[PDB]
Amino acid sequence: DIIIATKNGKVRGMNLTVFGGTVTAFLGIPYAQPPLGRLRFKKPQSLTKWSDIWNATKYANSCCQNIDQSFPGFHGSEMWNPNTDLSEDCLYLNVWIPAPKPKNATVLIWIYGGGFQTGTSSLHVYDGKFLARVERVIVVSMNYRVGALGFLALPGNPEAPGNMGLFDQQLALQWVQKNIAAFGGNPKSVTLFGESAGAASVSLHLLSPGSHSLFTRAILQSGSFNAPWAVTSLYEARNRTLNLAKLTGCSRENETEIIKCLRNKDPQEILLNEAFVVPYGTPLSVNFGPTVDGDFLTDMPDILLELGQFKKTQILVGVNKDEGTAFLVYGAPGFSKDNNSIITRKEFQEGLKIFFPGVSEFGKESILFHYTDWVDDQRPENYREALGDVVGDYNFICPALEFTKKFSEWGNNAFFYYFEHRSSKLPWPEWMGVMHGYEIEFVFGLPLERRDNYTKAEEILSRSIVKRWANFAKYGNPNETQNNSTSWPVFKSTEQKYLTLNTESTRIMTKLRAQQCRFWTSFFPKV
Ligand SMILES: *C1O[C@H](CO[C@@H]2O[C@@H](C)[C@@H](O)[C@@H](O)[C@@H]2O)[C@@H](O[C@@H]2O[C@H](CO)[C@@H](O)[C@H](O)[C@H]2NC(C)=O)[C@H](O)[C@H]1NC(C)=O
Ligand SMILES: *[C@@H]1O[C@H](CO[C@@H]2O[C@@H](C)[C@@H](O)[C@@H](O)[C@@H]2O)[C@@H](O[C@@H]2O[C@H](CO)[C@@H](O)[C@H](O)[C@H]2NC(C)=O)[C@H](O)[C@H]1NC(C)=O
Ligand SMILES: *[C@@H]1O[C@H](CO[C@H]2O[C@@H](C)[C@@H](O)[C@@H](O)[C@@H]2O)[C@@H](O[C@@H]2O[C@H](CO)[C@@H](O)[C@H](O)[C@H]2NC(C)=O)[C@H](O)[C@H]1NC(C)=O
Ligand SMILES: COCCN(C[C@@H]1CCCN(Cc2ccccc2)C1)S(=O)(=O)c1ccc2ccccc2c1
Ligand SMILES: *[C@@H]1O[C@H](CO)[C@@H](O[C@@H]2O[C@H](CO)[C@@H](O)[C@H](O)[C@H]2NC(C)=O)[C@H](O)[C@H]1NC(C)=O
Ligand SMILES: *[C@@H]1O[C@H](CO)[C@@H](O[C@@H]2O[C@H](CO)[C@@H](O)[C@H](O)[C@H]2NC(C)=O)[C@H](O)[C@H]1NC(C)=O
Ligand SMILES: *[C@@H]1O[C@H](CO)[C@@H](O[C@H]2O[C@H](CO)[C@@H](O)[C@H](O)[C@H]2NC(C)=O)[C@H](O)[C@H]1NC(C)=O
Ligand SMILES: *[C@H]1O[C@H](CO)[C@@H](O)[C@H](O)[C@H]1NC(C)=O
Ligand SMILES: [Cl-]
Ligand SMILES: [Cl-]
């Protein structure tokens, strides 16, 4: 039998045959009390015990969330939709262990993204058996509440204080600290890693004092808290809570009555109203996400980062070459995943209004000016490409770079990557390039599965990324080998060196997109 004793009871695993070896998987370990009934909107409560041997042999329920149904049958979007029953009873986690069982393995904890409204640990691109098999690390991933059920905020009120999903993550980090040694793992070697909102989440755990001792090191893939979508101000969050009460028939004299009313609502009644809590939106809208709750976050995160009030440790940060394109076919006029999406200069300008609703006309004018200095005047795909880069630079690349600069300025080693390979199996059209989220499958080592129809070059690339991530986790240094390996230099605010990741060559380069990002940090805010 495959049985591990944990502080909350014994749990039964299952064997996976991986690359002619065995990985032991414990899928769907509860780590918190089910946030049902009176526990809805509260911080997660510690788990006491489950009754008998818990069978962690199938993934757990995913947290409640609206589904992306924009493209029925399309793998490109359905690969992100939850693949287990949705339920409010979702606070579970997964643990993959190398066989034979390690004595003190480094632990990698995955935090999925999904704009704080979606995601689940059970997606196939987050399958952790490959990393455990190939690098002999332990992999943990957890489900955390998303949407209003996860980030409804009445700051100061324990009935709905804000940042519950972040606290879900945190409680799972505490569970690893309490229990991972029984799975053979080193609680003193724990690396958080995640993508998009998960990366924004990792970046917020660097700032949260309660998480300081729950992990060693941090990997931020295509995301950071200073991205414009990631953190809502204290009273912007409160306002949206009130509007949800309004929209559901739960407006009440005092706040606890409002929360009382919202606990009576069906989950679908909450989920289907989440989109209407803001006056206007964008394809990158986070209606209920992290906020300044005074508990998980004691000040605006921008300030804590400025003042060095964060966990002093090593980080690995990076972005993808076409972060913006994904969001274009979700509300930008003239953009379809089924044509080559050539757009006019007028369609570009309409896209700016879609993605920048509350920005002045001269604000849009200067965005347009900064992104039209064409190398070749036509080149009929200039505006199509300009709009992607605007969305990608403003929402992801430039914030990730600025976070890395300011963080490295306080003395810890920081490593930046620019991932430029488009997957041979990427189901979206070619014009969308190296999309948001499509480095993940390489990080988790799926190209290592030869029966899966990736190219040999993608196996080598994924094998190299898998080595660097695991080496970063074990050693604070994302090295590959000492010899025959391009060195990954530290990111330093003067030189700002980064490593490119693709199949042709991995080069050290400097000041990624500095001319574009300089616009977004030092001019656009003044507008
Ligand atoms: C806080 O937010 C409200 C927005 O409230 C609205 O009502 C909700 C039910 C929801 O459906 C939203 O889409 C609505 O926008 C701000 O009030 C606005 O002013 C009036 C008051 O109802 C409303 O008709 C307007 O549409 C809102 N403004 C815009 C630009 O749409 C309110 O000002 C915000 N700030 C504070 C401090 O409360
Ligand atoms: C977890 O599953 C066990 C049974 O699953 C199997 O039995 C194990 C001994 C092992 O051989 C596994 O590989 C099998 O998949 C549940 O066990 C109870 O006890 C016996 C076990 O065979 C069974 O006849 C009983 O009917 C089970 N009890 C009940 C009330 O039906 C065990 O209950 C499962 N754990 C939980 C928390 O449900
Ligand atoms: C040592 O291995 C190289 C490949 O190693 C490349 O990996 C990158 C991450 C980076 O660190 C880089 O400096 C490093 O060189 C081998 O070259 C590969 O060789 C095959 C042929 O066997 C070519 O088809 C590949 O294109 C080539 N990859 C490259 C150049 O990136 C090579 O076998 C070996 N070189 C020596 C001198 O021993
Ligand atoms: C179901 O509820 C709708 C809300 N969003 C739907 C999104 C819209 C855009 C993309 N996809 C994911 C996707 C598709 C294809 C390739 C890669 C990635 C579906 S969301 O909750 O998922 C969302 C919101 C705001 C984000 C802000 C920053 C980054 C990601 C965000 C995701
Ligand atoms: C689950 O995987 C473990 C690890 O591979 C298996 O345990 C091994 O089985 C072989 C075959 O007899 C032994 O030589 C090893 O000594 C075993 N290891 C341990 C730690 O006991 C186990 O058999 C698998 N469970 C299954 C297949 O149900
Ligand atoms: C990558 O670099 C790190 C150093 O940054 C190497 O780490 C040492 O690793 C060995 C394991 O072989 C440990 O026993 C030492 O204690 C480590 N020392 C230090 C100072 O880190 C690591 O070996 C390198 N790996 C490769 C493949 O190059
Ligand atoms: C696993 O590795 C840790 C270190 O990462 C070992 O911890 C001990 O040694 C550490 C020095 O690096 C310190 O944290 C402590 O001196 C000590 N830990 C204590 C006393 O709690 C740990 O022993 C290793 N576990 C193994 C090998 O099973
Ligand atoms: C493709 O996308 C939509 C079709 O649904 C359309 O509005 C747009 O103009 C089309 N662009 C083409 C065909 O170039
Ligand atoms: Cl995502
Ligand atoms: Cl093209």
Numbering used by the authors: 3 to 529
Quoted from the paper:
Cholinergic neurotransmission in the brain is terminated by the hydrolysis of ACh, which is catalyzed by two cholinesterases (ChEs): acetylcholinesterase (AChE) and butyrylcholinesterase (BChE). The assumed co-regulatory function of BChE in termination of cholinergic neurotransmission in the healthy brain changes in brains of patients with progressive AD. In specific brain regions of these patients enzymatic activity of BChE is increased. Altogether, these data suggest that BChE is a potential therapeutic target for restoring ACh levels in the brain and thus improving cognitive impairment, while also minimizing adverse effects in patients with progressive AD.
